[PDB]
Point group: C3
């Protein structure tokens, strides 16, 4: 199957034309949209969403990831193979930073085989349709990776301050704010569990100059309606939520904001 | 096939990983999204959307319904088979109220067979992915109902105000993209008011009253005018031709409406 | 395959039931959503989106186009085949204006064969589900065009001002999610050369913009004029929102001077 992730939006016809190109190449291709609502050009956000979603896709899955503000420039178009046997077709702009770091890099190829393109002369600003989609389509069809082009020894990496445990607390950043307003950080709940904390404990969540108390719980309903809670999200990350409410509003936080959780 | 309905939104990756899990259990599963934009936690809205959508799905359809604010709590995870031969995989929180009342209940099973789960250790807040989705996939693929778990004799029901005639009185059930206001009032029940097409009735919402023409199509009235008619599911719906009824009437779902 | 375009939105269950209907007629039907977020009743916007998307769909593609404010009225329901071998199932309200003009019309049939319907008695306001969807499904299965109904020798046309060159002038056709402003001006006509700086006039205000190939060819936040993925001249702000910066909306007149 092909996992599809972009910042194109479902309002425009861009997603549909890319799917048409894929289906023209392989009528039997299975395309699963991860999301097409990544905020415009937000590669940092996309890198996180990609990793978390990839955890639920099987080995051999080909991911079409296109959040490409540098489309048409000298930035490289690449295909990465992670040590967990998954494939990623994307621009070399750092969007593959998290999967590369979490799964390990097995091999990286630059897309040079023009025979895999949808058009002889790709549009200057829509490589997603003319280069990335068809390449993902061919790979998902059995095309050997080596046929995409020559290997690369490096790839662009997004500078990120790794979440660490230091003196009774864990420091990190807000990675994703979902539809409910739940605030998921880049702090692994396992890392958080090294602060010798447990469900039913109460910890302090610090955002900027504010400090909130929050119960460590398993489910939203484990606290009264409207109350804050700290729990592990579906991908194993520490998330802050408000039962039947919006944590991003209560904390007044947005993606990228530094967040601290004291024991 | 599988009818998918949630309050997860299409912006998050939640819907995609759920479909991936389903596709992993059954590569040829046909998944049709009813909607994933149900307002967060709004089980009442979902209960109506579910029923109206189900009317166009064939018998044997397995519906995956997940608007589950109680995920991870003691609330039951169930599978309901209605008398019209449709199956519903959902939390026991009242979201299946309308399909239960309209189609009647044939059987109810509590999801207990852990071998039907996606992961050995289900997440505390994403049963949609770890329990409901895979169970819906297995069911849509043949799995006998008895393989789900023990039977249940009752299910949580959403308290509702059954629409009656005496004028007609009901509630706004769904406000769609266009702002059309669909009620829980069957258009047939309304016709038992000696009313007829072309007649002008009065719409009473809150403390305001409007004049509305009984018509068949939006274009049967001048642009911007209010009309009362049967929507695609047989329910009385109020709309503004080339306009937004919800804005004009300044009404929201759950709102009580009166037609004299 | 079927290209699906409407103004129904993805929030409502309408799109879903329409797809269920297509699938019941043909379980193997391949449905590709072009968009369901066309502004309500905006047939003009839909006509441009339909054409631009259709350029990337193969011949023999069946397009289900339903932006039908006149649903339930005397407006005709039709099936149009264009000379580029694509089929369009839609209301006769001008939504097919652009594909008809750009590709040329091969034939038009009024939908009269009721055996192609979803139900004997179609709803008054959801022909998308009861008439258009099933018809598109059948055509996609190989149903001969002559089996749809009788031929029509005309169709409703949305009058439109054609862009020119004298500096060139045109109108904003589509503003995408990024805020990029795509016009109805073919970038070929426009072709001045890349790297030159031109003037963009949007009513009373004027802006300077670089003619470039990639958004990144200018500095962050700067304006550029380039060909979009369909070949139309588009105005964009690198890493920004041109629609906001230019304070323009679809339908607005746009001028570009050397
Ligand atoms: N105005 C813009 N500035 C920079 N990048 C853009 C702009 N519009 C679209 N893109 C990028 O084009 C890519 C698709 O080719 C998208 O992933 C998007 O990030
Ligand atoms: N902050 C929250 N409070 C209560 N329920 C929630 C919250 N966030 C998500 N959910 C529920 O989790 C379910 C998915 O597991 C969704 O159907 C949603 O209703
Ligand atoms: N209030 C309304 N006025 C006019 N047309 C409408 C209204 N609501 C829905 N429609 C049309 O009904 C069609 C679907 O049957 C849609 O394409 C939409 O344009």
């Amino acid at each position: 199957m092909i996992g599809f992730l972009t910042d194109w939006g479902l309002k425009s016809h861009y997603v549909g034309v890319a799917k048409a190109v894929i289906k023209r190449i392989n009528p039997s291709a299975e395309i699963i949209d991860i999301t097409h609502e990544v905020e415009p050009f937000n590669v940092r956000k996309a890198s996180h969403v990609l990793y978390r979603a990839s955890l639920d896709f099987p080995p051999s899955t080909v991911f079409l990831v296109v959040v490409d503000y540098g489309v048409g420039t000298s930035r490289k178009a690449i295909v990465m193979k992670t040590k967990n046997d998954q494939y990623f077709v994307a621009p070399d702009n750092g969007v593959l930073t998290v999967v590369a770091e979490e799964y390990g890099v097995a091999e990286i190829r630059e897309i040079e085989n023009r025979e895999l393109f949808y058009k002889k002369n790709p549009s200057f600003t829509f490589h997603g349709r003319d280069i990335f989609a068809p390449v993902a389509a061919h790979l998902d069809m059995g095309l050997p990776l080596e046929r995409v082009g020559d290997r690369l020894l490096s790839y662009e990496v997004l500078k990120m301050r790794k979440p660490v445990v230091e003196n009774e607390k864990v420091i990190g950043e807000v990675a994703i704010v979902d539809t409910f307003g739940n605030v998921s950080t880049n702090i692994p709940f396992d890392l958080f569990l090294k602060l010798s904390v447990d469900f039913d404990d109460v910890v302090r969540v610090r955002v900027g100059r504010k400090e909130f108390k929050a119960a460590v719980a398993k489910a939203f309903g484990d606290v009264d309606t409207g109350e804050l809670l700290v729990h592990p999200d579906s991908a194993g990350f520490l998330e802050i939520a408000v039962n039947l409410g919006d944590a991003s509003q209560v904390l007044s936080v947005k993606e990228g904001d530094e967040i601290e959780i004291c024991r």
